[PDB]
Design a protein around this ligand. Sequence first.
Ligand SMILES: N[C@@H](CCC(=O)N[C@@H](CS)C(=O)NCC(=O)O)C(=O)O
Ligand SMILES: [Ca+2]
Ligand SMILES: [Ca+2]
Ligand SMILES: [Ca+2]
Length: 238
Amino acid sequence: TASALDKSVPEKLAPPLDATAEQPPLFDGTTKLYTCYTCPFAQRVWITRNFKGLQDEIKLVPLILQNRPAWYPEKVYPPNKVPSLEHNGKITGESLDLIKYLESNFEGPSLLPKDPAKKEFAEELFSYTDKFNGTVYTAFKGDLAKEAGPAFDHLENALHKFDDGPFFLGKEFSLVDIAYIPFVERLNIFLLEVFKYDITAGRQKLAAWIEEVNKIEAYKQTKTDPKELVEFYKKRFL
Ligand SMILES: N[C@@H](CCC(=O)N[C@@H](CS)C(=O)NCC(=O)O)C(=O)O
Ligand SMILES: [Ca+2]
Ligand SMILES: [Ca+2]
Ligand SMILES: [Ca+2]
């Protein structure tokens, strides 16, 4: 199972750094993930780090984005977003590039299968990630079944492609599952609580997928506060 393959351990979390916090040594040879604990793009990299067993290797540097140290855009990462990864004398951004990079260049269990047909489907699903987010996050003011429905339907139908297991690529938990879960997690809570919309209604495979991803310790360790998420999304979109 995916849980058996998981190399994560329970982890103590340091408080996020505010505007006055000292800057961690830059390019001292220690690998660092600049992040924010509630950011779903960063959560992608967080889960990947955990699953591959890279927690000691990859130090977390969590920031309060609403009140972040100026040294971050000035001295670490000019695009001024999280996540970014400090490794091999550079700072690399883009959550999808980062989970791919952990998988191609770091130790730990595989998060991409070898099967060529699965590799191709993975690329299609990676490509669809911003269209998925684009569709649902712009649907809050309209008829949800018309506006957000087709995007969840796309995930439901994608899950019918490989019949050897409940994940997007079938049998094995992968980078694809990791790419989607932080957004499905938050969307599920927000839509149900605020709009009375159950994304799992009529989407059997999607429901199985959420349940199965949720058995994985690497993921559970990274989950955000439901109540805080709702207040945040009401303020952001309503
Ligand atoms: N396309 C980027 C987006 C990352 C991103 O937008 N992170 C947000 C947090 S949800 C952020 O750093 N926003 C703070 C800002 O823009 O100042 C990725 O996938 O890595
Ligand atoms: Ca390790
Ligand atoms: Ca099928
Ligand atoms: Ca399946």
